[PDB]
Amino acid sequence: LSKRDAILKAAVEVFGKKGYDRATTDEIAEKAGVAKGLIFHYFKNKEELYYQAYMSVTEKLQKEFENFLMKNRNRDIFDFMERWIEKKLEYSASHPEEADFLITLVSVDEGLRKRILLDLEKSQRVFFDFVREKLKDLDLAEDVTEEIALKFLMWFFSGFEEVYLRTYQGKPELLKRDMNTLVEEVKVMLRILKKGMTK
Amino acid sequence: LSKRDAILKAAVEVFGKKGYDRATTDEIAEKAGVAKGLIFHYFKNKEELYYQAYMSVTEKLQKEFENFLMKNRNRDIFDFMERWIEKKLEYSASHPEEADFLITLVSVDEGLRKRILLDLEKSQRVFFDFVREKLKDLDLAEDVTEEIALKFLMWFFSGFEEVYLRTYQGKPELLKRDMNTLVEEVKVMLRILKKGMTK
């Protein structure tokens, strides 16, 4: 790995296990196998290191979505979103160090947290842009405008993300035990969205 | 008003405008028209005062729901939830001092915030207990179990609450301008839930 990459990897691991406040650059350097001074060669400070690590992990998730989109782009949008949720769930289950790291954002210093939040937003754009265009292929139910359909999905996915985080954060074995039941539930919920939004 | 009630009223007003950290008991006493020492006669400290004020406002919202339930209990559950959302929205718009106060919870000291969060939960129980029993009257769509139906509603309402707060907190004039469009959207979304969940 390049020195920059070894550091970012170790940073994801140390921030994940210790949290933002208690993590030290000294700890990250040790984990990465580099002199303590090297962290400051590549990164201004702990804040910039955290930010770059958060961006590296987000970029990875963007890349997983890109790959999914190219392979599933012809599917009906409900079938597509269902499969994407299954893929997301399997990703989180198989990348526990990344998931642990991502949840630390809650407790990051207000300045850095504020600076980050919007980056994540910019980074889901492709998904909802896709949904918007694919809603155009549907025979939408009476009174269901393309705007209402998109807003409804946004709000439901927001609520699902919120409950998922509350339920599973820090609990990988619980997620492993619940996965099958969760997938079954997702399949049904996407069929409720399909049936309620289309004629 | 009783001395206790005058204080709680003023507390809702001062915490709403100044926030938890910057609000002082001295300011609340002045607002309430009582000697500074009286606050400590009724309340142990600022934390207990905030807690009792949050509970007083929550009790009020419980009472508004109770009144609604008794007057609308025979309605189909989708018609019922739609009308309840309309009533909630009109309440928030007509009680801006209460809404301003409620949103301060985010920034309350961790100990008190943790102690409070669950109280709000216990306090929406009647609603979801009602929804659970009323889902029994429906001819649910294939694959839609009463458990999946309840979870889907919970998650959607969570996402709606989250976006509403983000959009409208501190912005009463924006809510006033958007109300009509928001109500129209709610009517359609509840019809999508009805159509997707029932045969």
Provide a quick synopsis of the model.
Chain A is mainly α and 199 residues long.
What is this structure's SSE topology?
The structure is a homodimer of 199-residue chains.
Chain A lengths: L2 H20 L2 H8 L5 H5 L3 H27 L4 H18 L1 H7 L7 H26 L10 H23 L3 H26 L2
Helix pairs in contact in A: 1-2, 1-4, 1-6, 4-7, 5-9, 7-8
Explained architecture:
The structure is a homodimer of 199-residue chains. Chain A is an all-alpha fold and 199 residues long. The first copy, chain A, folds into 2 domains: 1-45, Homeodomain-like (Arc Repressor Mutant, subunit A); 46-199, Orthogonal Bundle (Tetracycline Repressor, domain 2), CATH 1.10.357. Chain A has helices at 3-22, 25-32, 38-42, 46-72, 77-94, 96-102, 110-135, 146-168, 172-197. In chain A, α1 (3-22) packs across α4 and α7 (110-135) packs across α8 (146-168). The first copy, chain A, is elongated and about 65 Å long. The A-B interface holds A 141, 143-145, 148, 151-152, 154-163, 185, 187-189, 191-197 and B 141, 143-145, 148, 151-152, 154-163, 185, 187-189, 191-197. The PDB classes it as transcription. Keywords: transcriptional regulator, tetr family, transcription.
